[PDB]
Amino acid sequence: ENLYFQGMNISEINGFEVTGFVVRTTNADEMNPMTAKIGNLWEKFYLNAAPKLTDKSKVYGLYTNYESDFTGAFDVIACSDTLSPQLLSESVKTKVSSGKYVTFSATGEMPQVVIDLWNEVWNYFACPHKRAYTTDFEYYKSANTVEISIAVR
């Protein structure tokens, strides 16, 4: 896969607030290229939100409001800590809670690296830990490095 898989680490993470665009989807909708929503969500973010970011802006992909488990619907939120629901129209503010997470990290071509990192997440949980299905997140640490933090019970 031509990725550097840095590995996984369990840790306590401090909560934080982020604002951005939300869409509701399912894994099945995302697997079908013709019905996927996450790509379009990010294009909207690039279009409407990116021009308003700063050099210290942190950018995230939140997965939250889970209907059930990985087989159910969930909200995906393309967002950033420096945006606010009134510096940006149609946006929603979410608080990610402090808690215990398992965090995975990889570096490579984007977005290949985030797609493939989710596969590592899948393999791992499908296990010493159980998913909380509260709020999980991609953190786009740099142009080539992404972390995925999964909330665990």
Author numbering: -6 to 119, 123 to 149
Task: Copy the relevant paper text.
We report the 1.8 Å crystal structure of Cass2, an integron-associated protein derived from an environmental V. cholerae. The structure defines a monomeric beta-barrel protein with a fold related to the effector-binding portion of AraC/XylS transcription activators. The closest homologs of Cass2 are multi-drug binding proteins, such as BmrR. Fluorescence assays demonstrate that Cass2 is capable of binding cationic drug compounds with submicromolar affinity.
Structure determination by x-ray crystallography revealed the protein Cass2 to be a monomer organised into a barrel-like form comprising an antiparallel β-sheet of eight strands. The topology of the domain highlights its pseudo two-fold symmetry, which is based on repeating β-β-α-β-β motifs. The central cavity enclosed between the helices of Cass2 is largely hydrophobic in nature, and aromatic side chains predominate. However, a single acidic group (Glu134, originating from strand β7) is buried deep within this cleft, flanking the pseudo two-fold axis of the protein structure. The polarity of this side chain is stabilised by hydrogen bonds to side chains of Tyr56, Tyr136, and Trp111. Between the helical edges of the cavity and directly above the topological switch-point of the sheet (i.e. β3/β7), density is observed corresponding to a polyethylene glycol (PEG) molecule captured during crystallization of Cass2. Hydrophobic side chains from helices α2 (Trp35, Tyr39) and α3 (Pro104, Val107, Ile108, Trp111) and the β7/β8 interstrand loop (Tyr136) are within 4 Å of this ligand. In our structure of Cass2, the site occupied by PEG correlates closely with the location of the cationic drug-binding cavity of BmrR. The loop segment following helix α2 in Cass2 appears to be relatively flexible in our structure, and it is thus feasible that access to the ligand site in the gene cassette domain might occur by a similar helix-opening mechanism, perhaps coupled in this case with expulsion of the interior side chain Tyr39. Despite being a single module, Cass2 retains some of the hydrophobic features of the interface, as well as possessing protruding charged side chains, including Arg149 (as its C-terminal residue).
